[PDB]
Amino acid sequence: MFQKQVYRQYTPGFPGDLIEDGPKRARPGRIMSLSAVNPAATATGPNRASRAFGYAGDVSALGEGQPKTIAARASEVVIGGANFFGVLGHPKHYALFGSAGDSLAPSYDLPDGAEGEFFDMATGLVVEIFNGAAAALDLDYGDLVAYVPNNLATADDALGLPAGALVGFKTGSMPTGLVQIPNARIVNAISLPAQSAGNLVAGVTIVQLTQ
Amino acid sequence: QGIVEPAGTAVEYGDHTNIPLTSWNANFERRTIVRGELGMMVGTLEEGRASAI
């Protein structure tokens, strides 16, 4: 079903999946609706997997009266935050829930108020990458990555980049409005074609070393 | 005397999530012993005189 082409090899992996085994770190969290942010979000998007997420607050109070029970230690996240919290991954954890039209429809986003696993360290992680300069770019083995915030000004966002997309860049040619992820490398080769607003090429998924 | 004081809290489950841990902290309490004394002394003439009553 749906297979109209035959290729010579299998894809190495899918976005949001671990491609190598080694040291790793992850934490759970609860997704907050993007509309809840007070200064409003200049950049918007869905809660797509393999996108960066930011810390929003603590939701461990679990009570309504004068005394409250601190039952668990939980964290609450938003699609784009100045403070980096992790990258959503491990798609096998969640449920499809179908879509608005009909069930059994391919969906790759999580609803608001749902749980998730976010990665701070990973030897090998397959994520989708983006081009932030609207021009042809070849990354090569050793590079740096960055993610779009919600508070990114429209003047610095001429391209319609999503809320929490990941952008690769060279050592000294970082875009003006992005937030860098320390000690992050591409550790793989990839090439991207020319880019323009409204015709944003989604790039190609690529291996990436978080820490 | 001693105390135990356990500690620990839980988080939501995840396949690749880190593992929370529990611990404890013991303390000790002390009290001090206090001693007292008291004496008496009787003389020969006063003992005989007091026997008159």
Beta carbons of A201 and A192 less than 8 angstroms apart? yes
Experimental method, per PDB record = cryo-EM
- What is the pairing mode between strands B23-24 and A205-208? unpaired
DSSP state of A185: B
Q: Do B16 and A119 touch (CB under 8 A)?
A: yes
Residues 1 through 53 of chain B touching chain A, CB cutoff 8 Å: 9-18, 20
Helical (H) or strand (E) element with B48 = helix B44-50
Nearest CB to A25 within list B13, B15, B18: B18
User: Rounded to 5 degrees, what angle do the CA atoms A52, B13, A186 make?
Assistant: 30
Chain B hits for A74, CB-CB cut-off 8 Å, are 11-12
Give the resolution to one decimal, in Å.
4.0
Residues of chain B immediately before an interruption (C to N > 2.5 Å) = none
Task: Please spell the DSSP secondary structure of A43-96, one letter per residue.
Answer: S----BTT-EEEEEEE-----SSSS----B--EEEESS-SSEEEEE--GGGS--
Beta carbons of A186 and A139 less than 8 angstroms apart? yes
Which residue, A169, A172, A162, A164, is CA-closest to A53? Answer: A164
Q: Do A117 and B17 touch (CB under 8 A)?
A: yes
Nearest CB to B16 within list A71, A115, A117: A117
Nearest CA distance, A72 vs chain B (angstrom): 5
Phi, psi (degrees; rounded to nearest 5) at A109: -130, 155
